[model samples]
Target chain A: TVVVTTILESPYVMMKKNHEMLEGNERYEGYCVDLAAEIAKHCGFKYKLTIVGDGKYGARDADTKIWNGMVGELVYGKADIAIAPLTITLVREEVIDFSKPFMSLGISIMIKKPQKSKPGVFSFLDPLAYEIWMCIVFAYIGVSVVLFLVSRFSPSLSGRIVGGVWWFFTLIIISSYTANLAAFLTVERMVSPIESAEDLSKQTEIAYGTLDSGSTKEFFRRSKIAVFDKMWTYMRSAEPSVFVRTTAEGVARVRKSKGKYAYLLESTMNEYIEQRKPCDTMKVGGNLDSKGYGIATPKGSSLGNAVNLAVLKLNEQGLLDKLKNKWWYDKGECGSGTSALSLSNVAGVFYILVGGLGLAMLVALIEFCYKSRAEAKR
Target chain B: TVVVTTILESPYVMMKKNHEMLEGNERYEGYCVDLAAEIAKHCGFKYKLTIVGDGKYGARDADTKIWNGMVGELVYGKADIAIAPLTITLVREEVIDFSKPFMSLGISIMIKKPQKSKPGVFSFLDPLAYEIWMCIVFAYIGVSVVLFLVSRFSPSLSGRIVGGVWWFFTLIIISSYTANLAAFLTVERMVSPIESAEDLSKQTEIAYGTLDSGSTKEFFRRSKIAVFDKMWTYMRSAEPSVFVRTTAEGVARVRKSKGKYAYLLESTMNEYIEQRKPCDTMKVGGNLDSKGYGIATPKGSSLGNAVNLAVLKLNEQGLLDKLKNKWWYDKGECGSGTSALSLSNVAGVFYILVGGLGLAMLVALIEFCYKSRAEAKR
Candidate 1:
């Protein structure tokens, strides 16, 4: 039986709590387990699953040029196949072959979103953009002016009727526009201090960093682009070091820094983390570089051809997307973020509206009393 | 000359820049200075403006039980009239007579304005609210189904034309909606976080404080209002007191805190400051309490009677309306708190019509070919 090796990472490969009764693969389950079963079924393979001895995703030592993690297992012939979040890089490609990338991603930054705010006291002014409101005002005035001049020229019954109807129509339109104006804020966006790689390099107020030993770190270190080079320079010299040894540590620093620190990593992991508890940090802007993840095998392995073709067929049939939905979305900690139209956000405007309405009622009452007195005198 | 006591407060009363060369009323300039002149002119009196010795609007100390500031000057008979932005409180009125408030104000909260973002990736989803969008989808399907059934039952030329026309109409509208794309969606308003005292009570994420020494602080200290009492307790116990001794210090702290802090002050000062450069903050909610700055007099002074009458008369004459707009209309240019989103911003959804129009014509062509072929075949 072919041996398939993977790392014990969240969602990808982790031990299940059922180990008290069952053994081996029965005691383990995750996104990768489901994926492994699918791949084995399609490829018509008899395989035994095993976790990688080293927990690392396999980074090559620059000095010794020795690979570690799942990639190391494949290279040293310890495992016949590897199925995990093994990043497909040019350096690793020379030693081991990666099938068509099962998933594509890029390095991205995560930050704590700014406070969700209620629209201002005068947010009613935003019902239509200033220009549109101005336009509506102008349109009404223009019609009024036209009607006034027309009546001056014609002074007929039909002219008066048309002008009066148009005026009332305009009034009703304005009222409905005011009435339908939004109550709660429509934007719950994060205040992204840095949107891209260029932004990260240009600003000093917000400090940014990446994982200590990932493809992202290597990207900056070896980048010829001025912005990435500068970012790498800052990361290298930053006291206490901006780089974190673990994703969890990086996330903790990001939350604790109160919007000062940004942590960069693969987009898939970043998005998955964003859906978890506290749910404060959000991935912002698009990714900095393009890359993907693949099932890995020794450079000239017999199963490489079959694995690549199986991946191609699965992608064509849309199984990877189905797997992602089952793991990431269905089990998300934070529910779909659709919120109710809260009265609090528009409480100020409602008060203003009520105040105006009350004043109108008082004026109407005064008018009624005055009219009655005038009629009595008559 | 009548002795009028005032304090040096911005916009209310202050020493004129060219005071060295002038004496009497011309030596001072401000909202209350002009207002004092108007009142004095109407009441037929000549008055000399003098600054209060204690430099406060008047507060009774908790421990000493002594009145302080401009109100103290008036109460002790050091001055015949107090004309400053001195708030008229119930306790002050018990000791001294206050003409109807010359200007009404309330203590309000100030926070850094949220950034108005462009509509997000799915901002198109915002053209209509989600339910509205769902309703339209349902309507389209329902209409399409009804038309299909009607046309199938009655296959005359007229029925076919009606069905075809509706198919075009439905296709065009949704298509038009789909076609219209915006670089940015609605001018996303950055709503202030703590819009009300209840909001202040609800969250610990945003730290808030008020001016250190003022009637605002005093109001909080003695308030029986549950929301106000809770905030007062938080302020009293909060490390590094939220109270700033001066408005300037409070503003500086707000800027340096990087949106972590919120400052509370009188609505008048809060609004005036919101208009200045580096406009990082905005006012939230209506006043927490209703009160005003009135011309104060000791128990019952002869000048107080005319001063009160003059204020009433001028208010009827609409001078207060005139002056508030002049001084209060300025909002900071860093960003507009009340967004004047132009036609370009709101007109985004309209352009969707242009795109939908294009698609409808194409669909019309397809339908035309199909219709002609079916008829020709018959």
Candidate 2:
């Protein structure tokens, strides 16, 4: 008999009618459930399914050398196989084997709509844009000429001159702005993004929520993001659950609350939520970091071969495609249509170009600074 | 004038040689060095040494409104005080303070040498004196009682009952041995004490260690013991010192390590280490559980008035002395000679009586069980 443990989630594996009539391993139903059934059919094995005792299967137990839930069942030898939407973490991977990602997504942030009274950058600079533009143009042309001359003729002495640094600065300004403009457009298509933590500080009424024991919380904690601390202080003043709900619930709360709440969720979950009826109400914002989810098994399990093969087959046959679609990933707002393309080869290429450009600019700045310092000494 | 903050530690604030050679606050050495003078003559204020920061001050951040160090300093505007060994914690008490703790300690496990081999009560009973007494008492009282009763009652019933209650027989024997002789001798001598967690596991071990956060690492990490999962596993596998060093190094490497290190330190330093340590490594172990050091302030500072006075004046006057030196109260090993007195108090009237009475009855029963279970039950 095998024990398959899972947390109770919506539209996932939930108890079916006559669930009580089901004995041993026949107690589950969901996308993973279908996948498990297919695998069983192909492999021709008799197995049992049992839900995990605790909702949390991912946590470690110091006293009992057991991992609970679907994850734990696989880990503690209670189950020969487990099927669930189990997101793999580095720590979990250490103790368990994982197939190629059964699913994958980036992580994104969601913020409450700012009050109308809050001023935008444009509000601060719109009247001054023309004035600033003229000033910048004059400075750029003037600085460029002087820098060219200094670089050409007075190599040693020019090293310390501000004029000698302008050439590289100009290059960086043009290139970085161009790239940022493109990236900004892409993010704008998904949601209104908060560009920096300082932007978050301007709104006093904003409330933020994220999973309690997740990377998002760690990011906020480690960054000591100015707003994050304020948010924490505000949240901690109340109950813990006010700020530390799971990603899906966080988004749900935000949607129902009409943007009074901001949520930090895994990119996929945000994408999933955005596809639903309240699509425009909640959306993924800012640049999402790419992270992958995998199918995990016990350490040193021979099932690795079978599980990896199953994932590859699913990916090949588009079973994963169908599953993704069924999960509302195909719907209008949260549709996987563009996401598939976005996560494809082109994104990788774009990242490489951005990285290369960044490196080049860094080198140019270093050279400019060195030469300018030398000229100043003279 | 700079408002330099510091946590209170001892010895470091002791009178220095050539005090006049020092300028300004330099004459005030030990824990309060930097802050004392800065708050005094330099700031143009008539200042006295007062513990300003609250118990939860070390973990606060002014910009983020996060608590870090001493409570009084962080909250009410007291004379910016200085001290030698203040600890830092996470409950950001208030915003008006800063500090640097000179030392750190956390709760640690300590055990006596004899109890190192076998852990718990079984080890103490395994010794020659204990074993002989147990055997003698069981044979004489227990067997004799059972035989007498059996002869006076139904013989066949006694055999059947004895077979059924074998475990109860063993329990009675063991409990009796633990109650009378072993309890008396062990209590009288004060020889047995567990100093460390490792010692607690070992038979000859009797756990004993400082309950302070500076010296003991485990006490500090209790709050987030789950997060230190890997490190905890690693420590459990290595030698005791390895665990200690790892904890100290871990504190240096990251902020918030205080809560994860389970360190039991002085109340003053509990706040200090939380702030200056890489992450917040100190938090009040939720009230002065097993009380010791406290902050002293002038009579009227509303911020920490009652609490500080309760900790200092009341505790010092020996009102807390009886509570402090309660028997079997688990005074951790490794303090001054005065702490040794705390250790012996464990074998006080209550503990010995309970242990002895419990064991004596247990032995008497085992003998009865050996002779006839039916009679014993009756």
Candidate 3:
């Protein structure tokens, strides 16, 4: 029986519970398990399943120059075949063989859906820029002063009339601006700071990073291209060390950091996280670099040809795509795309209007009392 | 006759070179001069144009606290009506009324035209992005190898031809790609790293700033928008300061700094520079915000309504657009976009092919001579 090595990645490989009293092949479940069974069925060979001891997809140690994880097991002859998400890179191919890739992927960014800021008390002021506000105040004071001077000194009839017109114009403009602005103050909005790697490097507000010990890390390190080189310099010297050891750790950092962190990882994992419950994270922009994963085997293994043929058959019949849809979308938890604002978001707008009208009525009553007292004195 | 104050801004207002030959209205020339003459003919008024003494486009001073430039001329009544490319801003509008805008403009980036990359022997690979090239190499190797192995083992009836077919497929693909790539390398390109303001703020490799005296500077200084705010912080704190005193200085800075610096200026001036004789710079992307230039007048001046109506009429009749076309396009010194490659750009590719073919001939000659020696020995 051919021995297969795989990682315990979710939706790919997992343990079969003993409640059903399963035996042998029945002791395993998931995509990889089913895939292994299918390969055996098509090639007419029996296979046994085992998990990778190191819990890594594969890597070569920088110091010892030794391969590790499922890839290492294949090179060392400890496992006859590796039926998991093994990345197909040039360095790995020299020492081992990989069947046609079953999955396609690329590096993507994972960001917690940016939290929309709640409108402040004067949200109505949000429509115009701060400069526009400054200009409005300056113009109001200028016109009010000019009108005062012209009235007192009998300045040019033209200046007096122009100042009066400007004052009246501003009164209408400011009131309408204030009216439209009332709703804005009560609503919230979200805007992501980083849309691409360049954005990640440009701003320091949000720290960005990726898997510390993977191909993604290596890509930035070795790149001679200016944009990537600039990013690598920033990523390397970053004080808090943006790099993380695992995808789960990266996801946790993204969740707990409010809107202040971005996680870079494979698009598959990023998309998967975007669909999970409490689905706060989203994949930003498009993938940076595209590559794929293939089932791996030792160099010159006799079963390499047979196993490759089975994968080809599966791919040609569109079974691989079917399997991806079954895991990625069929079982998706989060609804597609972003949700629109609900009553909870803009509720304060309505509340504030009621309170403002009440205050206006109170002011009018006090003014009436003062006028009545003045008339009585007269 | 009206005394019209103007600024000596490029393409806007400047002294006529032949000082001794011209008098009165003929003493000055430019877009503003042409506009004034047109307005005079249409409105039946004679006017004298004089450059603003301070050479500024209206800014308030902090020390003595007075408005300066063409705005100052109108505010202090030094001139009856100011007819230049005076920006119609809210603060300026309060101090002095403006005619409807004769020319609309916005902030845009200026960069030295990207250098044409010298073709290496492998310049043939320039057609696709890096990831595409990478995927093609690995998968091509994998597919070709597996097909060859399966055929050798008699795995299937189609396996042998598939292996041969793969070679032919790659041959045609590679040759066609190379054929297309030659044109790309020979045709110089300007791939400005920045596609927009967002892109401008996203990288540190290219420094970007605006003219020190124009609305471009104010747009960033008082902006509350996140991207612009961050960029403002950078521009404010940036070492050596990125601001330039005039459009000429900014354009010169871009040309000298090459790819290292980007100048931000009004789109009108930016496009004018692009069409000028030493046209080494390009305006990247569209303008950031829409604003305009107008003829300024004392508040409530009788001339205000007439000038505004004149401008509006000119705009409706396409006179403004036609005037812009006359200066920016009809009289343009720079040739049309992308000059076709001369022999110089593609000469390297031919040199490389020559060396390669010559080596092939050398190897053939040595092999034939060696075989003749071997047969003689036998």
Candidate 4:
């Protein structure tokens, strides 16, 4: 009999409601449990369910070379197979094999909606009338001051100051300020914290599950998400046990703690969390652009071809869809009902806001300097 | 004169021995002075040397999103130029431009020589010999004891015990011993603390530094050295200041305080240290690998082309060779001198020792298993 190992993540696989009353193979039940049973039936093999020794089923440990958790069990020869929602990652692929992703998800963020505000002093510049009036009043005052100073001072020095310094400064100030005001007004009304995958690129405090791996980790590594590298630096500091918790834990922390922890997970698991009664948490975002999951195997392992065919057959029989539905994944309706705000979009907004503010400050400084120069001439 | 910023690393760009006697640019002098003169002559840039505001010049800071030190000065537009042995990396490349490499170096290990022991015990098959002998002895003892006990009972019982009971017991004992021995040997030999990068990965209270940037930090990130990655992991856990020190400070710590700190620097620096009369320290082990230094500039900046061309001129004119001699790099002769080993050769030796030990263990395990199995059948 071959042994198949898994971890105790809710809905995916957990001890049955009456696990105490059952023994051997009957003691476990979940989406993965049922899926394993179907695969076994097709293959005609006797198998036993075994939990990985360490809670970390698949993780990279600097202290220990082993990728613990279910992934670890398979690599260390503790189990012949695994049928859990273990997301694939590059480091893990280097050590073990995985079947077709059976599921897909990306990292996302959820933040409280920001309070709305009236367009500030800078907003008035949007109207052409206001822009023209501002330019006329400032220019009139500047010319008057220059005439008064030039009449009182020597002709040569006064003319040089007005033409070379004062006039040049005024032009630079007006042009820079006008540009900054337009950009600032555009950003002030629209910017908000990350509520989706796109937005996540701009945020710094995204707490992801320690157990998450594969392309999910690579996504952040590659993406210009806000402080994504910093998050990795922070994660590297966590102790072994805390590092292995699922993305769900990170989401819960973000919700209750009001801290920066955005959880990334498979869409199926995200939807499953939303459907439970009380439905306090939701997936406010949608799928990141991606292809379906591919099965992974040890380099040149004999079982890869067979496993690939089995996955294809399962897909054709509608078994894959049934399993997804049974697990409560993707019950259509795009709202904050499931998934957080697309982190990528949130990142885009933040970039605009930060860039806009910086531009505004530069504009203000130039205007102030020009006005001071004009006043000094008088 | 243009401000030329540099970090405060010893034996390179440190304060002059009698700085109070000098003024302005003359207050600073060291290996950097020699290199700076060569670069200036080649590049045709008039400059004045100055220290960067923060001690951390070439490091990444997640908080400020700024690179400090001489590299930072160039990036932030605070200085006209920098002349230090900065190593180029992919991340740094994204933000700043770099000139052709000025020097090269790699990472290596420093450990007390291990005490010698019998080589067989280090192999996996050592226990197989005992297991085979134990199985044979146990079988013979069982037969003798069974015959003795049977003699005390009845003659028919004696024959049955000899042919049946003793044989059964011998088979059980041999099977159990075989399984136990395999497990025992695997645990004893494989569980060693010095195998693989993972085993060697740790954070001992040791000090280390680099020539600001380049391959040294990259080596730490991609260390294949035994336990070096573990050491890197440990260093990551430390306070930023403690874990990341200047190269000169690292060497100073190593020499003055026993082996509390390990310094990572260019082979040139390592050799220079070992040249002082009654040299206080020596480069332990070997060089890590070959890595080239580069001149960095802002992305898409015009300075990169100029710097690249200057590096080429310096190399062709033998000016680079003159600088190397002036800094006293690679002057030690082998067999008798204080700095007997070159940095490149040290790294090569480390690679050979580590690679050889790993192969030896593998061969020993296979030999032990083969010998036991063959003896078992006979």
lDDT of 3 at A268: 80
> Residues A65-167, candidate 3, lDDT per residue (tens digit)?
9889988889888899999888766567667866645565568888878556563644434555768757755765576566566777873766757867876
**Which CAPRI quality tier does the interface of model 1 achieve?**
incorrect
lDDT tens digits, residue span B158-277, model 3? 332343344333433343244334434333333556767777788887887777775567667764556778889999999788887866777788888887799887788888889996
- Which stretch of 10 consecutive residues in model 4 chain A shows the poorest summed lDDT? A154-163
Which number leads on TM-score? 3
Q: Write the per-residue lDDT of candidate 4 for residues B281-310, one digit (tens) a residue.
A: 555555657667776666656657877888
**All candidates' TM-scores?**
0.40, 0.34, 0.43, 0.34
Clashes of 1: 8
Output the chain A TM-score of model 2. Answer: 0.54
DockQ of candidates 1 onward, in order? 0.04, 0.01, 0.01, 0.01
TM-score of chain B of 4: 0.51
Clashes of each: 8, 142, 2, 58
CAPRI level of candidate 4:
incorrect
Candidate 2 is graded, for docking, as incorrect
Candidate 3 colliding pairs: A123-A185, A124-A181
